[PDB]
Amino acid sequence: RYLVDTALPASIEAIRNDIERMLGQPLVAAADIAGNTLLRDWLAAGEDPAQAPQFIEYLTAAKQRNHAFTTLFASTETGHYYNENGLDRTLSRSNPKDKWFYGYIDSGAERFINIDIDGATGELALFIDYRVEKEGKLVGVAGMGLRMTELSKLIHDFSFGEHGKVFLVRNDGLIQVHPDAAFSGKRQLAEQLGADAAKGVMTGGESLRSSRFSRDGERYLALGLPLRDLNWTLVAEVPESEIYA
Numbered sequence: 117r118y119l120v121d122t123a124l125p126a127s128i129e130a131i132r133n134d135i136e137r138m139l140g141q142p143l144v145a146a147a148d149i150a151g152n153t154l155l156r157d158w159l160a161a162g163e164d165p166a167q168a169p170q171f172i173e174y175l176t177a178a179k180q181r182n183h184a185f186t187t188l189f190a191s192t193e194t195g196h197y198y199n200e201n202g203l204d205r206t207l208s209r210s211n212p213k214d215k216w217f218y219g220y221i222d223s224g225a226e227r228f229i230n231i232d233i234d235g236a237t238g239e240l241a242l243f244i245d246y247r248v249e250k251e252g253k254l255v256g257v258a259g260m261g262l263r264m265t266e267l268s269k270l271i272h273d274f275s276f277g278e279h280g281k282v283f284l285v286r287n288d289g290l291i292q293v294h295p296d297a298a299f300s301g302k303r304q305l306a307e308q309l310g311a312d313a314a315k316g317v318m319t320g321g322e323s324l325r326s327s328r329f330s331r332d333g334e335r336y337l338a339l340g341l342p343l344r345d346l347n348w349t350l351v352a353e354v355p356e357s358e359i360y361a
């Protein structure tokens with residue numbers, strides 16, 4: 117019942133819903149690549165070179181149509197990793213840079229969301245990966261990557277008022293997307309808010325969470341609202357004097 121009859125809860129929800137739409141496009145598009153039954157069959161049947169150019173054309177089309185930084189699939193049998201330009205490299209369990217792939221397939225989880233360094237380019241990206249399965253048997257992984265600098269830019273444009281800031285935080289407290297790109301995937305929520313307020317907005321149900329915190333004697337309000345499709349939380353920070361406008 118805090119701020120219920122204020123415009124603030126609806127304003128945060130409108131931001132939350134816009135962020136879910138924009139993240140929803142790569143979620144959906146990456147799922148389409150992994151679920152593509154023609155690709156599943158090509159991976160299961162051993163990556164016939166005769167059809168490889170046409171699957172690279174397909175990844176290129178999906179990247180451009182969906183404005184992704186990169187699109188990709190990898191075979192769990194050969195370790196071969198393909199992106200929109202072709203066969204890039206072979207993964208290996210003994211290489212720490214490939215931990216993401218083996219951890220994910222070992223996990224069996226239906227989806228992987230991960231901030232990581234793109235192996236082909238060295239760029240910080242948000243990756244979305246799904247299992248590729250045939251008759252129950254894992255044959256690959258596929259998905260797409262988004263450039264972290266672009267995501268920070270998108271989160272920054274949702275700033276509001278004089279000092280209203282918005283963050284996307286994994287439900288463990290690590291800030292995934294920060295308006296200042298330097299801190300995306302690197303800053304803990306406690307660094308931004310203080311431990312009490314971080315705990316406050318990260319603890320709760322599916323309704324708006326809130327907590328007060330002080331920043332050099334300036335009183336602030338912290339808000340939290342879960343995303344429905346990701347295990348992430350939208351966190352907003354606004355000075356108390358800005359609550360109304």
Ligand SMILES: O=c1[nH]c(=O)c2[nH]c(=O)[nH]c2[nH]1
Nearest residue numbers: 216230232233234235236243
């Ligand atoms: O978590 C990751 N998912 C990927 O799809 C990918 N691709 C890549 O090069 N590195 C990573 N990391």
